[PDB]
Design an enzyme around this catalytic site. Structure first.
Site, PDB file in Angstrom:
ATOM      1  N   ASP A  35       0.795  -1.216   0.000  1.00 28.29           N
ATOM      2  CA  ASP A  35       0.000   0.000   0.000  1.00 28.29           C
ATOM      3  C   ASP A  35       0.834   1.275   0.000  1.00 28.29           C
ATOM      4  O   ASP A  35       1.384   1.668   1.031  1.00 28.29           O
ATOM      5  CB  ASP A  35      -0.916   0.004   1.217  1.00 28.29           C
ATOM      6  CG  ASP A  35      -1.749   1.256   1.303  1.00 28.29           C
ATOM      7  OD1 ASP A  35      -2.252   1.725   0.257  1.00 28.29           O
ATOM      8  OD2 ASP A  35      -1.893   1.768   2.426  1.00 28.29           O
ATOM      9  N   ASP A 221      -1.311   5.280  -5.487  1.00 23.17           N
ATOM     10  CA  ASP A 221      -1.697   4.507  -4.312  1.00 23.17           C
ATOM     11  C   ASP A 221      -2.172   3.096  -4.643  1.00 23.17           C
ATOM     12  O   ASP A 221      -3.335   2.878  -4.964  1.00 23.17           O
ATOM     13  CB  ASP A 221      -2.785   5.263  -3.561  1.00 23.17           C
ATOM     14  CG  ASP A 221      -3.395   4.463  -2.449  1.00 23.17           C
ATOM     15  OD1 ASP A 221      -3.074   3.268  -2.335  1.00 23.17           O
ATOM     16  OD2 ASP A 221      -4.210   5.032  -1.696  1.00 23.17           O
TER      17      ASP A 221
END
Lengths: 377, 5
Positions: A35, A221
Site C-alpha cells: 500500500d 496509491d
C-alpha cells in the site's frame, strides 16, 4: 538478480496485491498487502473472522512493546492497535532482516477483506503521514537505513481477464516493461503526490482548470482499487465517457458502480469505451508526458455466473483528491524513485489489452505554467 | 487505504 523478486505479489483479484513477509523469531509467515497510500506497517495481531492467521507477539522472542496505542483511518475501513517493534524479513525480496516498527492490529472495522488472503498492510509512503506522527519510521525508511538496499522500489500490478504482480525492492527490473520510462517529480514527500496537468477522454480535453484535477492532491496509491477523481472532475469524466460509449445505453447506477454490466462471454465490446489519458508534469521545465489506460483498466472484472462476463465501473468520486489506484497502476510499471524524488511510468509488459489498443506512456508535450496546477492550503 | 492529511 531481481529475478528472485519477479512474481512476488499475489492477489485474490480485486482484493489487493500482497507480498509474503515473515515477522519475529522464530519467523511467523504473513501475507502483507502492498500500500503506497498509507505509511504504517501493521499486521492483524488478534483473531478475526476474515483472517486465517495472525501475529502472535506472545511467541516472538525478538518482539518489544512500545507502550503507545495507534489509530489509522483509511478512506475505506479503519483499525486501532498496539505499537511494537520486531524482526522483519521478506522471502522473495532481499535476503536482509530489519527491526522495524509494527502495529499490532487488535480492533478493526471494514478493513480486512473476506477471501482477500492478506492479513496485514505495508504502508510504503513517507513518514510525514505515519500514524500517530512522523516519529514512526515507516518500514521502508528503516529497510534502507538498516541495510544496503537503495532508496527505490517499483511495482508491477497485474490485472485479470476472462491475479499476480511483482514488487521490486531496491531496483528496476527492465523485463517487466516495454518502451521508455517517464518521470514526474514527487511534489512533496508525504503521500506520493504528483501533479496532473491535463485530462483527456478518447483524446478530448476535459477542459477544466488545471487546479481542479489536483484538487487537494493527486496521489499514486496501490492500496486503492479505483481511479478516484474529485467531484467536479468525476462528474465531468462520467459525462464524457457516457457520451463516447453511448453506443449502448446504461443504468444511472452503473456509473456509481452499484450495478454490473454483462455480455455473452468474450463479446465485451471494448472498442466502444474511450481510453483515458492523464498528462503529468514532467521532469524538464515546461514539459509533460501522458499515460493512457483502456476500458480494460477501468472496467474491473467481477466473478453473477453463467456464460457471461460481468464488469464493475472502477472510476468513482473522491472528497480528498485524485487517487491513481490499481485501475491506473494495473497498466504500468511504476517506479517509486524515492532517492531522486520522482516517479516513473512505463507501459507494463503485462497490462491487459486487446489486439487494436494498448496502454501507453508517451512524451514530451509542451505544457506551460505546470507549477500553476498544484493546489494549496 | 490513509485518510485525513
Amino acid at each position: 538478480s531481481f529475478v528472485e523478486m519477479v512474481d512476488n505479489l499475489r492477489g485474490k483479484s480485486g482484493q489487493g496485491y500482497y507480498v509474503e513477509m515473515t515477522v519475529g523469531s522464530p519467523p511467523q509467515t504473513l501475507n502483507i498487502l502492498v500500500d503506497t497510500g498509507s505509511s504504517n506497517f501493521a499486521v492483524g495481531a488478534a483473531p478475526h473472522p476474515f483472517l486465517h492467521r495472525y501475529y502472535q507477539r506472545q511467541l516472538s522472542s525478538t518482539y518489544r512493546d512500545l507502550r503507545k496505542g495507534v489509530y489509522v483511518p483509511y478512506t475505506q475501513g479503519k483499525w486501532e492497535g498496539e505499537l511494537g517493534t520486531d524482526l522483519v524479513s521478506i522471502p522473495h525480496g532481499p535476503n536482509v532482516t530489519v527491526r522495524a516498527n509494527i502495529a499490532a492490529i487488535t480492533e478493526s472495522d471494514k478493513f480486512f477483506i473476506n477471501g482477500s488472503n492478506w492479513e496485514g498492510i505495508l504502508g510504503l509512503a513517507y513518514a510525514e503521514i505515519a500514524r500517530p506522527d512522523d516519529s514512526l519510521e515507516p518500514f521502508f525508511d528503516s529497510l534502507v537505513k538498516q541495510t544496503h538496499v537503495p532508496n527505490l522500489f517499483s511495482l508491477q500490478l497485474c490485472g485479470a481477464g476472462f491475479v499476480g504482480g511483482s514488487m521490486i525492492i531496491g531496483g528496476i527490473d527492465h523485463s517487466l516493461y516495454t518502451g521508455s520510462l517517464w518521470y514526474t517529480p514527487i511534489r512533496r514527500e508525504w503521500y506520493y503526490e504528483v501533479i496532473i496537468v491535463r485530462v483527456e477522454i478518447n483524446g478530448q480535453d476535459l477542459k477544466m482548470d488545471c487546479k481542479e484535477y489536483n484538487y487537494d492532491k493527486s496521489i499514486v496509491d496501490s492500496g486503492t482499487t479505483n481511479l478516484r477523481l474529485p467531484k467536479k472532475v468525476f462528474e465531468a469524466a462520467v459525462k464524457s465517457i457516457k457520451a463516447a460509449s453511448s453506443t449502448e445505453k446504461f443504468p444511472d447506477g452503473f456509473w456509481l458502480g452499484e450495478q454490473l454490466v454483462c455480455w455473452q462471454a468474450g463479446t465485451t465490446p471494448w472498442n466502444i469505451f474511450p481510453v483515458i489519458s492523464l498528462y503529468l508534469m514532467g521532469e524538464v521545465t515546461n514539459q509533460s508526458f501522458r499515460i493512457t489506460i483502456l476500458p480494460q483498466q477501468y472496467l474491473r472484472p467481477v466473478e453473477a455466473t453463467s456464460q457471461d462476463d460481468c464488469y464493475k465501473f472502477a472510476i468513482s468520486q473522491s472528497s480528498t483528491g485524485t487517487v491513481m489506484g490499481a485501475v491506473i497502476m494495473e497498466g504500468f510499471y511504476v517506479v517509486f524513485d524515492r532517492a531522486r524524488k520522482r516517479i516513473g511510468f512505463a507501459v507494463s509488459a503485462c497490462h491487459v489489452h486487446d489486439e487494436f489498443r494498448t496502454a501507453a506512456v508517451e512524451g514530451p508535450f509542451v505544457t506551460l505554467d505546470m507549477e500553476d496546477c498544484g493546489y494549496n492550503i | 487505504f490513509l485518510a485525513x492529511p
